[model samples]
Target chain A: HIPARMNKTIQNLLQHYNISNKDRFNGKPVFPKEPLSGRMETKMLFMGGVLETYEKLIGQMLEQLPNSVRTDLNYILKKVQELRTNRFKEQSKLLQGLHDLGDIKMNNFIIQSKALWELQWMYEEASSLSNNTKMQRRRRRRR
Target chain B: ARMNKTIQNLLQHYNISNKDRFNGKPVFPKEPRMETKMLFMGGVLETYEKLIGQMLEQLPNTSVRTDLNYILKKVQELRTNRFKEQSKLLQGLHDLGDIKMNNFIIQSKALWELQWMYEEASSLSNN
Candidate 1:
């Protein structure tokens, strides 16, 4: 429905994830629980990039979508992934703080351990994989 | 809770009731007297499939098409599981009074929405 207004949705998702990371770290809600605040903060935006970029990866999944859309869509999707990973690194800082509170809780440590491994994988992929390297270079050039 | 230490004030409130009740008990309604309504989020899939279909017709890519389809199917599966298993656990807590039913429903629905989000998000962890 939001053909031309997709970026706005992506921004909204970014803002909420930011606030959620704040809340999760601080053990308090960063965003107020109000109706207007809800309107301002949270709405569906998960597909803003993916749906836009669908054509680049698999081409338009439909009958009449334009091929030129692939360029911008791919760009936005890659940017969104980078943003998400960066936010995860920020959030993971909270896990190290937990170790300061005493012995690490087994359950919590186990879960964060798995996440850290995944993030390490992402980091290595970005640094090593040739296409991933090209992706970062291309993104930098675009910027 | 309905009365305090002041006997005079208690008598004043108790005597002011003009309505006659033989049993002298307050009435409690048996059911919620609110109107029924329904809402849905159906058009999203419809819109997406249509748009994707259009794109597929104009372009000739198979990787994204299959990946998107897989993501969509995976999300629905995750959503169904959340509602079936996780929702029930939270609602059970609400019944135990650990949290309100409204918040329970909100949190469960939040988890359901997240399944769709993560599908689009991690991108199948890029295979």
Candidate 2:
């Protein structure tokens, strides 16, 4: 389990970026209601939405930090964007039914797993940086 | 030789239908001998403890420090619990040259959990 303070820091960052905790799709289904045909599509759509949110959050973080600290954050933002683009390409392939079912499933699994791991790393990095910034702001307020 | 039943069951649980083989042997071989396995587990625990100590030195007296301390305490607790069980299992196996599959599974699960905790701590400490 992650630390309580880390979770709070991330929540504050999300709030700062205007990224709502509510579903990005306004409580609507991201894919059509076809059960069998929409299975992987549904998952990919949801995964893409999550990736988009993280991309935005990291982009905001890049803007807030100093130039010296921007490099690592920028790198993370690029990675999030790349993964988002990859998710889109995978969704295209699924929509076209261009690959074997098993192959599609495997690719999706690998992409989703990698995305989650990257996002975890991003969260940890962002939380650490944000907490440090918060402390600096507090010290300045007292001065 | 056939794959060990425990390994087979684990692979199946992960939905790995196509197990890789080489020269008529499973790429994922049977569990190593119990003594060797215990030694490796002990080594992993020690390595992680050392890493945690180094990370703690770098961390400030912030909430992250508190969280890392909490995790370190947990790792110690796990080590204590594991060694107690391990000694009992090792002695039983020495007396009979056999150990339960469940015991091995339990040990593997605890080690995996420990590894996950270490990864989190490492990520938190990273820039």
Candidate 3:
């Protein structure tokens, strides 16, 4: 998944999308916008229009889960929204310090859709990655 | 026999750009849950897989083990495939509990179930 830029551009884009990078993106890019950011660092970015490709792929995935599984997932997403209004109020208190970060329009429609996709994928990959890592670690530790 | 099943309202809930060619169908549930459901009911299949594995391990004949292995693994998959939709869950696979399902591997439920019953009934009559 390539963002337009894996550099500060996407980090900046996250704010516009109202997404916080808790586990995904980390606090900031290691390379920033340096010329050698791509060369020196292994930061990856979605090269635009990848969204449609992911839309189809992830849509197909969510479809296969059973009713109860999907219902549990939807419940988790609703809980995230419950925090949104509270977050708005909390952040508003600090609005004076970060008042003019520019007039960025947070597209709620796309952002929410993207978050759902991200959460599902992270849940899936978490399992896959954990399984592989456990297996690999067993062999390595034995050695 | 008519049976109602759990509905997947999500398919119609979303919009698609195109519905053409070999690869563009996004709205369809393309067995992506295959692995997840495999995990979900894995305990059930684990018993069957284990039972067959023991049966295979018991028999000394390589050919028998090979044949049974194929049947066991294949039916295990069909068991999961059969479990995908809710309609089949209540009664399960009604007809083809026995009399061999070699052809059922290639054919689908719509056609195979009828053919299976016909073959079984005809065999019983001749016997």
Candidate 4:
């Protein structure tokens, strides 16, 4: 049940972003096989778009959560804000120059990809609880 | 060899000469502000420890407490090893530039993991 819901949410997110060529094997979704384009600016834009979209989706999921749950989740949200403001935004200034940005690129990739992964994890975790709560309420109604 | 305009601008800003290098490798500025960042990271971890303790106290499920305990222990270890690993990295390092960059990346990853763990604990508490 959880995997089905997770897969659907992932599909919806990808489709919403118009990212195609998604595949699945062994019941797990696979991202595009090709690495991100080598052009630095292109990579930056792509990562930025995806990160923004993931944050939006996570925000929507949090809205469905109970107040107590959302309160606890606020801690994670604050940390995310710190990373975005302090690390990602500050480092992006270095992208203006023609100098080799190998290190900055690598660091940004780590931050972007890891943020996406963690956001997905949190989304799934929250969704599972929401689903369970709905099921319990439905069962109570039937009783 | 030609230098990029960006490098030139940074060098000028820092008042560093084009030929400045330590053993033929570019060196980082004397102050990387590593200690300040490390202190911030420590404080972040301490806060997580306290937050998890509160969650554990309110949660009554055995399995939930067990998982929260595991996360608590991991955060504790990171708090302890944060300084120890920094000391080790400093001991074996030649170029402060490389060390500082590496340390920043490591700390960023740590911060990421801590956020994930905190979210996980919160989710478990909701269950």
Model 1, docking class: incorrect
B64 in model 3: Cα distance from truth in Å? 2.3
Query: Model 1 scores what on Cα lDDT?
Result: 0.29
Tell me model 4's lDDT, rounded to 2 decimals: 0.34
Clashing residue pairs for model 3:
A2-A45, A2-A46, A3-A45, A3-A46
Give the Å shift of residue A137 in candidate 1.
50
- Lowest-lDDT window of 10 residues in candidate 1 chain A? A35-44
- Chain A alone, TM-score for each of the models? 0.21, 0.35, 0.20, 0.34
C-alpha TM-score for every candidate: 0.16, 0.21, 0.16, 0.22
lDDT of 4 by residue, A15-98 (tens): 322322232123322112122343333333223322333343345546654443344345445544554454345223322111
Poorest 10 consecutive residues of model 2 chain B by lDDT?
Answer: B22-31
Prediction RMSDs, each to the true structure:
29.4, 25.3, 28.9, 24.6
TM-score for chain B of each model, two decimals: 0.23, 0.37, 0.26, 0.38
Q: For residues A1-143, what per-residue lDDT tens digits would candidate 2 score against the true structure?
A: 54454344434433333433353334432222222222243334333433443454455455555542354445545655665564465443322221121122222323222222232233233223323554346335645
- In the range A1-143, model 1's lDDT, one tens digit per residue, is 22233444444433422334333445322121221111110111212222222322222212223333433434444554554554333222222222121132222323222222222232233223323444335435534
DockQ each: 0.01, 0.02, 0.01, 0.03
Q: Model 3, B78-104: lDDT tens per residue?
A: 445432321122112111122122322
1 against 2, candidate with superior lDDT: 2
Q: Which is the leading candidate under TM-score?
A: 4
Error of 4 at B96 (Å): 39
After the best TM-score superposition of candidate 2, give how far the Cα of residue A101 lies from its true spot, in angstroms: 31
lDDT per residue as tens, model 1, B1-127 = 1112222232332243233332343221111100000000111122223333443354344343444344335334433422232223222222222222233232223322332444444442343
